[PDB]
Design an enzyme around this catalytic site. Structure first.
Site, PDB file in Angstrom:
ATOM      1  N   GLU A   1       2.763  -2.076   7.662  1.00  0.00           N
ATOM      2  CA  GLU A   1       3.697  -1.941   6.551  1.00  0.00           C
ATOM      3  C   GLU A   1       4.913  -1.085   6.919  1.00  0.00           C
ATOM      4  O   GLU A   1       6.006  -1.303   6.394  1.00  0.00           O
ATOM      5  CB  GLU A   1       2.973  -1.407   5.306  1.00  0.00           C
ATOM      6  CG  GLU A   1       1.946  -2.402   4.751  1.00  0.00           C
ATOM      7  CD  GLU A   1       1.363  -2.012   3.404  1.00  0.00           C
ATOM      8  OE1 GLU A   1       1.841  -1.043   2.782  1.00  0.00           O
ATOM      9  OE2 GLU A   1       0.413  -2.695   2.963  1.00  0.00           O
TER      10      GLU A   1
ATOM     11  N   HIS B   1       0.788  -1.238   0.000  1.00  0.00           N
ATOM     12  CA  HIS B   1       0.000   0.000   0.000  1.00  0.00           C
ATOM     13  C   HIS B   1       0.822   1.292   0.000  1.00  0.00           C
ATOM     14  O   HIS B   1       0.520   2.222  -0.748  1.00  0.00           O
ATOM     15  CB  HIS B   1      -0.985   0.013   1.172  1.00  0.00           C
ATOM     16  CG  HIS B   1      -2.070  -1.013   1.064  1.00  0.00           C
ATOM     17  ND1 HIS B   1      -1.960  -2.272   1.610  1.00  0.00           N
ATOM     18  CD2 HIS B   1      -3.287  -0.963   0.474  1.00  0.00           C
ATOM     19  CE1 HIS B   1      -3.062  -2.956   1.362  1.00  0.00           C
ATOM     20  NE2 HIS B   1      -3.883  -2.185   0.672  1.00  0.00           N
TER      21      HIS B   1
ATOM     22  N   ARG C   1     -18.030  18.794  22.907  1.00  0.00           N
ATOM     23  CA  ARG C   1     -19.303  18.098  22.722  1.00  0.00           C
ATOM     24  C   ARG C   1     -20.371  18.346  23.803  1.00  0.00           C
ATOM     25  O   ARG C   1     -21.535  17.974  23.614  1.00  0.00           O
ATOM     26  CB  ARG C   1     -19.055  16.596  22.536  1.00  0.00           C
ATOM     27  CG  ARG C   1     -18.317  16.230  21.241  1.00  0.00           C
ATOM     28  CD  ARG C   1     -19.192  16.408  19.993  1.00  0.00           C
ATOM     29  NE  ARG C   1     -20.559  15.928  20.205  1.00  0.00           N
ATOM     30  CZ  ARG C   1     -20.944  14.661  20.099  1.00  0.00           C
ATOM     31  NH1 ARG C   1     -20.074  13.714  19.768  1.00  0.00           N
ATOM     32  NH2 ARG C   1     -22.209  14.337  20.321  1.00  0.00           N
TER      33      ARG C   1
ATOM     34  N   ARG D   1     -23.871  11.457  18.208  1.00  0.00           N
ATOM     35  CA  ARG D   1     -24.357  12.637  17.492  1.00  0.00           C
ATOM     36  C   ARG D   1     -25.769  12.376  16.957  1.00  0.00           C
ATOM     37  O   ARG D   1     -26.015  11.349  16.324  1.00  0.00           O
ATOM     38  CB  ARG D   1     -23.405  13.009  16.351  1.00  0.00           C
ATOM     39  CG  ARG D   1     -22.086  13.634  16.808  1.00  0.00           C
ATOM     40  CD  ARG D   1     -21.169  13.934  15.630  1.00  0.00           C
ATOM     41  NE  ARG D   1     -20.115  14.886  15.977  1.00  0.00           N
ATOM     42  CZ  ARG D   1     -18.861  14.563  16.293  1.00  0.00           C
ATOM     43  NH1 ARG D   1     -18.464  13.295  16.308  1.00  0.00           N
ATOM     44  NH2 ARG D   1     -17.993  15.517  16.592  1.00  0.00           N
TER      45      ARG D   1
HETATM   46  O1  LIG Z   1     -15.200  14.606  17.046  1.00  0.00           O
HETATM   47  C1  LIG Z   1     -14.171  14.280  16.405  1.00  0.00           C
HETATM   48  C2  LIG Z   1     -13.450  15.277  15.736  1.00  0.00           C
HETATM   49  C3  LIG Z   1     -12.301  14.964  15.007  1.00  0.00           C
HETATM   50  N1  LIG Z   1     -11.887  13.691  14.965  1.00  0.00           N
HETATM   51  C4  LIG Z   1     -12.548  12.601  15.658  1.00  0.00           C
HETATM   52  N2  LIG Z   1     -13.796  12.984  16.343  1.00  0.00           N
HETATM   53  O2  LIG Z   1     -12.412  11.505  14.761  1.00  0.00           O
HETATM   54  C5  LIG Z   1     -11.111  11.687  14.167  1.00  0.00           C
HETATM   55  C6  LIG Z   1     -11.170  11.336  12.693  1.00  0.00           C
HETATM   56  O3  LIG Z   1      -9.938  10.750  12.263  1.00  0.00           O
HETATM   57  C7  LIG Z   1     -11.362  12.663  11.980  1.00  0.00           C
HETATM   58  C8  LIG Z   1     -12.841  12.894  11.663  1.00  0.00           C
HETATM   59  O4  LIG Z   1     -13.103  14.278  11.404  1.00  0.00           O
HETATM   60  O5  LIG Z   1     -10.838  13.651  12.877  1.00  0.00           O
HETATM   61  C9  LIG Z   1     -10.752  13.173  14.231  1.00  0.00           C
HETATM   62  O1  LIG Z   2      -7.798  -8.772  -0.414  1.00  0.00           O
HETATM   63  C1  LIG Z   2      -8.273  -7.642  -0.678  1.00  0.00           C
HETATM   64  C2  LIG Z   2      -7.875  -6.980  -1.844  1.00  0.00           C
HETATM   65  C3  LIG Z   2      -8.391  -5.720  -2.155  1.00  0.00           C
HETATM   66  N1  LIG Z   2      -9.281  -5.154  -1.332  1.00  0.00           N
HETATM   67  C4  LIG Z   2      -9.769  -5.785  -0.123  1.00  0.00           C
HETATM   68  N2  LIG Z   2      -9.138  -7.078   0.183  1.00  0.00           N
HETATM   69  O2  LIG Z   2      -9.813  -4.701   0.800  1.00  0.00           O
HETATM   70  C5  LIG Z   2     -10.267  -3.583   0.008  1.00  0.00           C
HETATM   71  C6  LIG Z   2      -9.546  -2.314   0.423  1.00  0.00           C
HETATM   72  O3  LIG Z   2     -10.476  -1.247   0.629  1.00  0.00           O
HETATM   73  C7  LIG Z   2      -8.638  -1.956  -0.740  1.00  0.00           C
HETATM   74  C8  LIG Z   2      -7.162  -1.985  -0.336  1.00  0.00           C
HETATM   75  O4  LIG Z   2      -6.678  -3.320  -0.122  1.00  0.00           O
HETATM   76  O5  LIG Z   2      -8.921  -2.865  -1.816  1.00  0.00           O
HETATM   77  C9  LIG Z   2      -9.899  -3.846  -1.456  1.00  0.00           C
END
Ligand SMILES: O=c1ccn2c(n1)O[C@H]1[C@H](O)[C@@H](CO)O[C@H]12
Ligand SMILES: O=c1ccn2c(n1)O[C@H]1[C@H](O)[C@@H](CO)O[C@H]12
Ligand SMILES: O=c1ccn2c(n1)O[C@H]1[C@H](O)[C@@H](CO)O[C@H]12
Ligand SMILES: O=c1ccn2c(n1)O[C@H]1[C@H](O)[C@@H](CO)O[C@H]12
Ligand SMILES: O=c1ccn2c(n1)O[C@H]1[C@H](O)[C@@H](CO)O[C@H]12
Ligand SMILES: O=c1ccn2c(n1)O[C@H]1[C@H](O)[C@@H](CO)O[C@H]12
Lengths: 241, 242, 248, 243, 251, 244
Positions: C77, C5, C220, C165
């Site tokens: 990875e 990836h 919140r 929410r």
């Molecule tokens: O209320 C919140 C606000 C921010 N985040 C969180 N909850 O989830 C995290 C997500 O990765 C992403 C989703 O907006 O940012 C972080």
């Molecule tokens: O074995 C696999 C192969 C591909 N995928 C899947 N499994 O997961 C999905 C992911 O979103 C995205 C990244 O792996 O692609 C789809």
């Protein structure tokens, strides 16, 4: 007898690979009477079996009784004898206001409020119907002109508490199911019955094709206590043969 | 603008009711370019959104990224803007020996090996696709003449341990998932992916129509790691649902 | 090229064993800019990677995207490539009345409201931070003089229902999460977030060191969504860079 | 009719408070024949009911069919009509080496491998029999001179996978039930049946009295299928001590 | 000399004993052993105090468990290693039913499993059930003494406070699972709360050991009058005479 | 004579104490208090022996918990009712990692919840995590004392035998859940087995109380099943000094 419960041999089926599976033994003869060369096979417990012919091909009609455990015995032993396609016809209680008594319901998948399905696949596994079976059931309903609804069914191990009935001896519903009917209604669930989760899970996880159709006998938004579907299921079986 | 993540208004959609939702932002324009009047709308994080037209009707294409969590954000916010029909197109690793690379798979329902589906419905609720969406998807694959399998998908929160991959840093798999692949194979499960259980549960439990289609890129019976008709199929299926 | 990836080789890292892992790709280079000899490595889907140098030592900055699923791909990875210490930087929704927007929150452990952590350890296993990483983050925050709060964080697989929410399409929250925010608050939980449970469980159960830090963007107890703005917080970024320095 | 399934009124029971509940409808007449003034009541689905008399007091015999779902229907509807004491009689497969075909087994409590019991009480609640009922069954058994074992029963929603049978269409058993028979055996579990977990749970959490007795029909240490009496007398004698 | 890790006992200490009375309190041991012939102190380590005495000329052990399933599991396991096959628990308890009075005696047929240690012997679907012979001996012995006796189900909890839905605490809050739980148990016919019957009954039933459970009601949580120390120890003594008398019929 | 129902203590007995050291063995209580100023015996009921001492002019409690979470939860709660806000646990433990020696000291950051009592305060997804200030004081106290110290995850079990995967028992049987479990925690980098930390850490963390966990290794399970003032007891006293 090749099987322990049904009292049937493989020769009894005359090469049949499809079965219609009603709940009530009383209904088995009526279903088979709409096909050619109907003959009584056996009757043990709630498992009444008949053999019929549809467009030259052998067909089984066998009852399951009430509940998943009983259903699981009939399906397993039918599979041992050669059945690969199961079509379920039953009765049901609608929980959506727009669904009326007389309407026909086709189930795509089931909410697993049973125990028997867990004996075949863990809860994460879906209680899904076979695509070809479901198609055939929807096409058959369309040709007959019945008012029909497609979607999710809640399949429960109990008639009373698991379907949130309060008109009982205790008048009580355990925590898990308290307020559950309102929850399924909001999730878009059509109806309650007591056998589909077991049937659908056990077939989908074992290479067997299954479908589910039912007639509405009560609407729970009005009352707790209370033909076309029979023609639909036999018509669907013709396309799956 | 109207929504927190996507950066879209209701007006941006111009009446759109249907959305195609791939995982990769890079495929969004490619899918949109197959339809009439392709226009870019916005691009924030995982979420790249495009508007096109199919038979004179507005259609959205919006990426989800990898995973149920980010998929649930895209689906929710598109629903606030007026989308009622969602079609996922993805890529997948087949686990049945009879399914080859390049084949197309249509998901009827998903094994729930995710966490986000539980935020919409309890585990006993089935992760089932909408029937009209599935019909269109199967009928489109047949019209284009693709090698097609219809059935159950295993939808995992992880690429590695949840799909029982051992060629990892640790080389170990937790009790729950040790021996799980053989178990899914024996149960008739077609493939692994990472988004369907979330998409399908959150749609079926909120009165939203959803379908799932994917092109096979690898087969797990031989290796852990590796134009498709899949994209043509999803566009043809979307046409039939408008 | 060595991984499926991230599009990286072990060579790209140049001996690096510590990575700073933000959520948003657009934060990667801005974080890398505070460090010496910054260079862009790769960008695939939501994994944007940069290499920088801190006190003459190679360090990686790599995005995760939103959610544990993509976090678990990134962390795995990177570990294959040589990374043994992970420091996450994100944003968060506070659930205590006294926490202000722009305050820095350091997570000791997380409430496992995710699914991916269950792919490494059963629910019994704690989603706990590495003590050395936590110490570095706490000591770094004191050096900056930021308003800091240390404790437990609830890590949800969803932005909406799992963080209770209600201003949504359905306006509905499933039984499990109905009344849940009030319960976490009473238990002393500081904030809502979406990646820490997966990250911390992954690392703690596989012999990798992990720290977790985030800046508040909404409270919140007063609103679900922050108000929109036009003008283009950075305290947590300085703290995470300084914490890495103390760990190298 | 006062109930939805059974086709019975309160007047049909004639003030009866105790019911013997066999699995098989065929047994209803045979159990009722051992008592006096026996008469048929109704038959709908898997629910065949008879009424009889024991020491001048009315007793009900009513079938449940196979499984907990069906059992739950009969038990609930009999409760609505006035029944407060339930004695189940069935057939069972033994899983202990020291338990042979023809032996009589009395259940103190059941392993809950069903789904219907959960519709009444959470899993932590015991599927336990009433002490008065169990005593009456144990004592009825010793006076007839039958080989009796008293203990825990495994109560399953399936005949095949949940009892770990491999002679099936698929030949496989799901993870949960794989290697499970050996485990129950080491835990001192006597036998397998399909209705006791539901029956005991729904009675014990609703103020109703229940007991469970069954005869050994197959030994699972040597075979899966059986083919290749005393219990009926015991249940009637037990009921007599309970009126 | 010891044959076990915790208890500090040998097989010689037992003098061929095969039955044990297992109370909670270390200090209760000597008092229960005082109702039998020729009691002698054997050992005392941690919360485990042990005595030997004669009953109808047969050797009997009395050994404390401490509060809770974890320490109960240690005691029962190590006694079984030493040769004990029958266990009888005597306790004190709080009734949750209005019709059950202070001073009444309760015999447990089986327990609601609100503990963690029973899961270390059997999964949750296995019943926390008493041995039939032990329950028979207790019910009949209760008739010999003349107690007002109730027979049924007991809620066995890993905590004294929130698991028994007590709100008069430092935090004053009860976790979701146990909020509204007392009312539900009351409806399901549950008699009382205590803290170790689930562990004991599960670990014995699943391992070929016989176990029984009897207790005296020291308080009722539906009424507002709370009994004094004297009346409580009068109730405890009443239930203690029943466990010794039941043990006689189990030799 | 008593403000609490089990410990047999009054608020007055504590003399303003806000910190408690909470060992498992009642017999070990006196020896810990003897390391501090002006030790006085308070009470002894069931498995609960409590002593009061002084440290830099401040009153401190040493109170016995008994074996297991249930007994621990009673002690912590009633001690909290009388004003205690900081709890420091000192125990003994069995190591499951090859690199840890008998005589080493282990500071717990969080616990694997193999208990039942923790669930009475928070659902399973809540972490059984120690207080950061308490863990810091314990880690720093270890340096000053000079012991070989490891910091990390601890498996906290409701049993001594089956839950620690011990086979030398009456039945010789281990339930499915715990079959092969020791090898699994081992691969997950878990240091050791004890019986109280999950209940203690969870109940304090979810109720606004501060808690810490230290222990001395009495056996290594990769070599031996059954085992057979120390560094750990010195460390807990030094840590308490730093948290007053
Ligand atoms: O209320 C919140 C606000 C921010 N985040 C969180 N909850 O989830 C995290 C997500 O990765 C992403 C989703 O907006 O940012 C972080
Ligand atoms: O074995 C696999 C192969 C591909 N995928 C899947 N499994 O997961 C999905 C992911 O979103 C995205 C990244 O792996 O692609 C789809
Ligand atoms: O509300 C209802 C009404 C009918 N049914 C259903 N629920 O359960 C099904 C049972 O097999 C049987 C019980 O009457 O019929 C189906
Ligand atoms: O192995 C067995 C043998 C008999 N039984 C049991 N398991 O299930 C019980 C069913 O009600 C019915 C199924 O045949 O009989 C009881
Ligand atoms: O309500 C009660 C009252 C008493 N008991 C019970 N619950 O728990 C038992 C403890 O071992 C111990 C704690 O008081 O005594 C038993
Ligand atoms: O493996 C071990 C070794 C010791 N301990 C622990 N596990 O359990 C703790 C008990 O309270 C007590 C019982 O041995 O000591 C602690």
């Amino acid at each position: 007898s090749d099987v322990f419960h049904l009292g049937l041999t493989k020769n009894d089926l005359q090469g049949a690979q499809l079965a219609i599976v009603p709940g009530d033994p009383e209904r088995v003869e009526k279903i088979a009477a709409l096909m050619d060369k109907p003959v009584k096979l056996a009757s043990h417990r709630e498992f009444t079996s008949w053999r019929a012919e549809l467009d030259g091909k052998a067909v089984i009609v066998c009852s399951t009784g009430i509940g998943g455990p009983s259903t699981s015995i009939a399906v397993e032993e039918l599979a041992q004898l050669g059945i690969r396609t199961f079509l379920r016809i039953g009765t049901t209680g609608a929980i959506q206001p727009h669904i009326n008594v007389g309407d026909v319901l086709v189930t795509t998948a089931s909410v697993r409020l049973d125990g028997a399905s867990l004996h075949f696949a863990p809860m994460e596994f879906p209680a899904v119907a076979d695509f070809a079976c479901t198609t055939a059931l929807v096409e058959a309903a369309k040709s007959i002109g019945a008012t029909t609804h497609v979607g999710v069914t809640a399949s429960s191990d109990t008639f009373y508490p698991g379907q949130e009935r309060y008109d009982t001896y205790s008048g009580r519903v355990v925590r898990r199911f308290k307020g559950s009917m309102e929850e399924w209604q909001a999730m878009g669930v059509m109806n309650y019955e007591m056998e589909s989760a077991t049937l659908l899970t056990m077939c989908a996880s074992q290479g067997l094709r299954a479908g589910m159709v039912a007639g509405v006998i009560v609407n729970r938004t009005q009352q707790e206590i209370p033909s076309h579907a029979v023609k639909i299921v036999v018509e669907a079986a013709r396309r799956l043969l």
